[PDB]
Amino acid sequence: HGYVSSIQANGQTYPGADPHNPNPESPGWQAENTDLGFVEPSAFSTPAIACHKNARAPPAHATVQAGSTIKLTWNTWPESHHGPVLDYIAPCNGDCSSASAGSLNFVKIAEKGLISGSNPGFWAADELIQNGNSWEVTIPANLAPGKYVLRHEIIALHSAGNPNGAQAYPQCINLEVTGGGSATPSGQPATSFYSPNDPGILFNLYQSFDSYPIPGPAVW
Ligand SMILES: [Cu+2]
């Protein structure tokens, strides 16, 4: 349990989207993750998996040049919640202030899963804790200018050995990308990412293994 509480682009720092205090200057999507909780695998076929429960587009955006870095800080992250950290992006039409999360066509732009070991092993989520509860996302240098939605996610696997036990923590952020990129992605809705029986979703931390198959589509 946790949420993205701060968003940095050089510098400019923005507050994250606290579900108990919707804030007009935050570029984080305004969701009903009031427990700072997760979306369960049975909901991976519903719009909740895009930007979290009942998420609504915010009226602010972070501005960032293609090729530069966004640094995201979580308010906290528990050591128990081992799992991958994944980043996706979708173009957004219009000013992105009325966009439906379920209609966004995302591509994956970065991922990290198991780093080393097993039972339970050391994971991207553990690195995120060691970094200071923070993660960096590089916006692809050839991404064309425009309005986009960044979807940053941890999938916690501490109960994922049981059916419906994985816990997905998506957090969406409105971006305006600037610069000299030329390419636009051809993505798919977030309901296409994951299934309850994917090997990286139904995954037992508490045994020996030497790899982890990261779920979702290929990095763009
Ligand atoms: Cu939790």
Residue numbers in the entry: 1 to 220
What does the paper say about this structure?
Discovered a little over a decade ago, LPMOs are metalloenzymes that utilize a copper ion to catalyze the oxidative cleavage of oligosaccharides and polysaccharides. The thermophilic fungus Malbranchea cinnamomea contains a host of enzymes that enable its ability as an efficient degrader of plant biomass and that could be mined for industrial applications. This thermophilic fungus has been studied and found to encode eight lytic polysaccharide monooxygenases (LPMOs) from auxiliary activity family 9 (AA9), which collectively possess different substrate specificities for a range of plant cell-wall-related polysaccharides and oligosaccharides. Most significantly, McAA9F has a broad substrate specificity, with activity on both crystalline and soluble polysaccharides. The structure of McAA9F represents the first structurally determined AA9 LPMO from M. cinnamomea.
